[PDB]
């Protein structure tokens, strides 16, 4: 039985899929702009904090596509109060037990929970992730909660790579049987579960690779360097 209106289930759903927080995009929809009755209500003089500038006190190469980070604000939050006091906040308690808040620089989304736990996504660098998180913590402080920027941690780094050559997925799936899963009628990519580093690679026919599960960017580079000779061996000539 699934109920993402429950705080714990909503938090765990972010990191609990088959690919974990790779699929965080499923939970940051907030309100549907095209749906007229779906808009988050705000107080008449609610401030838009999306331009927040203040910070709470503290060859082939893969590219970083996304960084997911966690922050402990250290205080309980009334999510309905946060939503009403911030025009850049979206809150649908019946669908997901978090306030969805967005800022423009670095362009990110925060998932803010009643316990004061926060998840920040959308950043392309560790410094941007930390900068955005410190801004969300400041916004919560400005609304009036005794929030603190603590326990910043990168939970996931998504990498993407294009090897610029097609891949023989049948032979790669057969040859690396124990570490691969390939069901092309169910999902187009070959799922490669690397042991060391512990990284999931999504290998597509086009030579486009997606790497997920890293908590350090060095793991993305290591996984790509490890898989590159395998991809070259299975190049479709």
Interacting residue ranges for Cl ion, rule: CB under 5 A: 168, 171
For residue 129, which of 101, 110, 150, 148 has the smallest C-alpha distance? 110
Return the residues of window 31-90 that contact Ca ion according to CB under 5 A: 31, 38
Fill in the per-residue mask, 152 to 181: x = in contact with Ca ion (CB under 5 A), - = not in contact.
Answer: -------------------------x--x-
* Minimum CB distance to Ca ion smaller for 92 or for 129: 92
Alpha-carbon dihedral sign for residues 27, 31, 33, 36: positive
* Minimum CB distance to Ca ion smaller for 64 or for 190: 190
By a kind-dependent CB cut-off of 5 to 8 A, residue 38 interacts, out of Cl ion, Ca ion, none, with Ca ion
Q: What CA–CA distance (Å, rounded) separates 149 from 130?
A: 10
**Residue 70 CB coordination number (10 Å):** 20
**Least distance to Cl ion from the beta carbon of 171, Å?**
2
Please enumerate in sequence order all residues whose Cβ is within 8 A of that of 51, keeping only pairs 6 or more positions apart, or say none. 103, 104, 105
Q: What CA–CA distance (Å, rounded) separates 140 from 188?
A: 42
By a kind-dependent CB cut-off of 5 to 8 A, residue 151 interacts, out of Ca ion, Cl ion, none, with none
**Least distance to Ca ion from the beta carbon of 100, Å?**
8
* Minimum CB distance to Cl ion smaller for 46 or for 230: 230
Q: What CA–CA distance (Å, rounded) separates 107 from 120?
A: 11
DSSP 146-198: ----EEEEEEEEEEEEE-SS-B-HHHHHHHTTTTEE--TTT-SSEEEE-SSS-
Tokens, residue 121: 């996504």
When asked if residue 92 is in the footprint of Ca ion (CB under 5 A), the reply is: yes
* Minimum CB distance to Ca ion smaller for 29 or for 144: 29
Q: Using the rule CB under 5 A, which residue among 16, 17, 29, 171 binds Ca ion?
A: 29
**Least distance to Ca ion from the beta carbon of 169, Å?**
12
**Least distance to Ca ion from the beta carbon of 15, Å?**
21
By a kind-dependent CB cut-off of 5 to 8 A, residue 168 interacts, out of Ca ion, Cl ion, none, with Cl ion
Listed ranges 21-29, 73-81, 124-132, 207-215: which one lies at the site for Ca ion (CB under 5 A):
21-29
**Least distance to Cl ion from the beta carbon of 52, Å?**
53
Instruction: Tally helices (H) and strands (E) across the chain.
Output: 5, 10
Identify the helix (H) or strand (E) that includes residue 61: none
When asked if residue 30 is in the footprint of Ca ion (CB under 5 A), the reply is: yes
Q: What CA–CA distance (Å, rounded) separates 227 from 177?
A: 14
Q: Name the site residues for Ca ion (rule: CB under 5 A).
A: 29-31, 38, 92, 177, 180
């Amino acid at each position: 039985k699934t109920n993402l209106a429950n705080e714990d289930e909503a938090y765990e759903a972010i990191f609990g899929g088959e690919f974990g927080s790779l699929e965080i995009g499923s939970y940051i929809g907030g309100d549907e702009a095209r749906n007229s009755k779906d808009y988050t209500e705000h107080l008449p003089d609610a401030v838009d904090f999306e331009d927040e500038d203040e910070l709470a006190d503290d060859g082939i190469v893969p590219t970083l596509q996304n960084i997911v980070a966690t922050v402990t604000l250290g205080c309980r939050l009334d999510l309905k109060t946060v939503a009403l006091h911030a025009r850049n906040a979206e809150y649908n308690p019946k669908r997901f037990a978090a306030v969805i808040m967005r800022i423009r620089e670095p362009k990110t989304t925060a998932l803010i929970f009643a316990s004061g736990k926060m998840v920040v996504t959308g950043a392309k660098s560790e410094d941007d992730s930390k900068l955005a998180s410190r801004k969300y913590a400041r916004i919560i402080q400005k609304i009036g909660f005794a929030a603190k920027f603590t326990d910043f941690k990168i939970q996931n780094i998504v990498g993407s790579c294009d090897v610029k050559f097609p891949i023989r997925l049948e032979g790669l799936a057969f040859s690396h049987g124990t570490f691969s899963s390939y069901e092309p009628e169910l999902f187009p990519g070959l799922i490669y579960r690397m042991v060391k580093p512990k990284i999931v690679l999504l290998i597509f026919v086009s030579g486009k690779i997606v790497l997920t599960g890293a908590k350090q960017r060095e793991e993305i580079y290591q996984a790509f360097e490890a898989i590159y000779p395998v991809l070259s061996e299975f190049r479709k000539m």
